[PDB]
Symmetry: none
Subunit: 195 residues, 6 copies
């Protein structure tokens, strides 16, 4: 009975209710690891068949096959959707801009600055600050991320014929959040959804 | 390539032209070492310092140029570029087959491109290394209308009203990319919305 | 050494893209500018004016030397900033303590214990601290990078061309905050705080 | 000579606490301006002078107080918490330091060594020679006194331990912890709990 | 022969100064946007149109100016000082070269040869044919015009002297020195080399 | 004695200083590589391009300086220098023994040299790397009186009349050379005639 009443509302929402909060997300070429290929107007992230030799840049992940969106949000309510190739290792999440770009601890969910849902093939996890949380398998090839910066939470939704809670974190976000993407297996691809 | 349709286009206002709007985005792989991209791949600007972009066969190695990602062989397409008032830049179109090396790669200096060029105040139109002097204009915006159905491109000076700058009737032999040229300290092209 | 000497060798070996990890916007402060220094392009450019600017008297304002400071100072963290300069002119790029005297020739950057600078004079380059000069090799570079480390107490002046190159450095355990400091003193002389296009806008 | 200084200079907090001492403040030394609280662990500046009984031990000029015990042999470490944005000093003195006149101020005489906060600016003092020190976020100072090899070290205590300053002296008599509180909000708390 | 040209390519500053001549800018030829200063020694881009009287010899379209004198025989060497980051051009035209239309731009006709600074990029231009030259830090160019053996050399002039480009040509008339300046900042200064004597 | 004679020279008119006139001519072996000599060894001007002067132990390798041919250990000597209004330049005296290398060879930055310096509009007096700020002046000409007998040098500003800029009392230990310093584009020093 505080603003957990807002959280309880958002967890109940249908697709058409979440699409009210739709944002365009465009991948930031400066952040992409050498192993991550950008395509379809910077909309699709895939494991390139060989490392890409991108220029050095303070924004660029040097260690983990990761890439960030261009825009960050420190206020308002934002929803985006990402289609996954089934039977692959990838992650979809959010991170502070101050998240490290170097080291094994730059891995999405392996630090305090990042929050994600992983697929190791069929098995699904939620991660934050190097705590894993095993979840029920889903056949859904699409995740919806709802970030509420006004009332400090994020929700990961599996999106099929309907929409089902995968996980959520309440946090007092200390700075703006960037959409974050992780691709690992040869065949991994994360497509940001446009219409 | 109908003579009647072309007259229709030349008489169209902005709102009539905006009917064929496409969203153009700059192709990071084409931008020259001294052209920075910004505002979500929307703005091209001359950089004093090298950007050290990777080698790529698509990359302009000599002229301060960058292409869109998408080309067009059918239909009708319109896009706008805002330019810095007192600067040196070119807005045009080119075949993907256009050379990326040497002075031959300069927009309007080869068979593969058509463009309108600002030299501070001295406006020109170019194709196959042939220049045409055009009147000055205060307009800081050009609209490109590409008609791949009836093979013509029109360059419009966009201000309070729309005014013709030049046009090229051509039986296009492959797809056109939007093409951008910026070559002076402080020179920028911004694709509009 | 072991820890303060090795974190310095790491910063000394850094490239431009690595140095830009620590980039900070610097704004020139109209309250500090000598009467003969005009500010322009949103307090980004310092030039000699032919004719006085008639600024508000201010205790922080340089009365003798054609100098100006940035608005913000730094007592922790790692800060990089880049200054474009005109070729054949008299100018200096530096840091100082807020406590630095604003009057007299003593207030000239590097001529006192509260300031450290690199200085272009005629065609020759010198590092100054505490009125001690060090001759530097001439460079074609028309851009200087200042790396200030307030966590481990050193400042590095880089010549920024196609690569970065060491001009000079100072270790000092800093006793207060450092302000970016600028000197311009020839009819045409100008310094420009860069907004590197390498970084997002 | 000095190799034992270098060892102590390198020590971490848990290696210093090997030499920990309880320090209690002496009610008889305390100036009228200094209030004493907790269990004679805390020196604050009273809202009004306290009117303590006269006593040969009592500071009559400077707002100062000593610990009960003194040390002429062994190695001793203690920590004091301060309010960050105030005027205060933490040191050691000879029992023979004057309790009278402007000369009795901590560090203004050959009989005392301390570290001083003038709000944000930090100084070390001895024999009325001020030395300007690096400012730090530390709200705690650690005093290591080695009477055996004749030096004192003041450490800033935060997450880690940073040198503020040290003095090499052939100490000619026992040393008392010494405390100066000046500004209305000034507070020095001796650490155990 | 080609031997006389091998000797001039190999000449140093001191050897080339043997043929120094004073160039003065011809205030009758200067486009309305080309201010002359310091006794017809400096060509800059005027902020306002300079309101010269019309004249048939005057440049109507291009920001261009010629020397007073031309040269049909002998050996001549001059030095122009330029500002680093500007559109500018240094060369030689026949007097018969056109003053009107974009055919009048230096290097964009058969009447002229030049070396051009396209901000950072350096070109040699003859008869609307462009050749690409390595970038130099040099802010001074040396034209050596040998009328007697038909060639012109453009030298970059810094601590030593470096070839930029040369043209062989059996010239058919008198060559004027020719200057192009086109950007707010642009200035060309005809040098009075201090190596030589002022008394 | 050394102060009564000093007062007599401070009170002298221009014509009375020209009693002690010397022709000063520039020494080609001392001229820095970017210092050109012109008008029969009378004008020192900053050169953009190196002049390729032969190596010489007497030549200034860092500072844009040049000395006169002759030095003086006895007598009273007066010469004048015309400066460019808004420029960077120095006029002084120095020992033969003054360094010709490095920043320490700069006029007035060593114990072997005394000068008056223009930094555009800021006038200074220098000796042994000690600066005395001086009032500015519209005068574009300095007159140097060197008294080697009573051991003092005066720097006069010369316009319609003559005004003290500064004076140094020295027990001079060796001969004094006229010293010149030009350090900006288009800076020139001119040694005046009758």
């Amino acid at each position: 009975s505080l603003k957990a009443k807002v959280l309880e509302t958002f967890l109940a929402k249908s697709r058409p209710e979440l699409l009210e909060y739709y944002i365009k997300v465009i991948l930031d070429y400066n952040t992409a690891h050498n192993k991550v290929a950008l395509s379809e107007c910077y909309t699709v992230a895939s494991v390139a068949e060989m490392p890409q030799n991108y220029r050095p840049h303070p924004q660029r992940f040097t260690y983990c096959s990761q890439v960030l969106g261009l825009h960050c949000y420190k206020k308002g309510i934002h929803y985006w959707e990402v289609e996954l190739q089934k039977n692959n290792f990838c992650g979809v999440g959010i991170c502070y801009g101050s998240m490290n770009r170097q080291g094994p601890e730059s891995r999405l969910g392996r630090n305090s600055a990042s929050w994600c849902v992983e697929w190791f093939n069929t098995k699904i996890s939620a991660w934050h600050n190097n705590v894993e949380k095993t979840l029920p398998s889903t056949k859904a090839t699409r995740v919806g991320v709802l970030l509420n910066c006004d009332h400090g939470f994020v929700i990961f939704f599996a999106v099929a014929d309907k929409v089902h809670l995968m996980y959520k974190f309440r946090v007092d976000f200390t700075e703006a959040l960037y959409p974050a993407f992780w691709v690992f297996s040869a065949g991994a691809t994360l497509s940001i959804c446009s219409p």
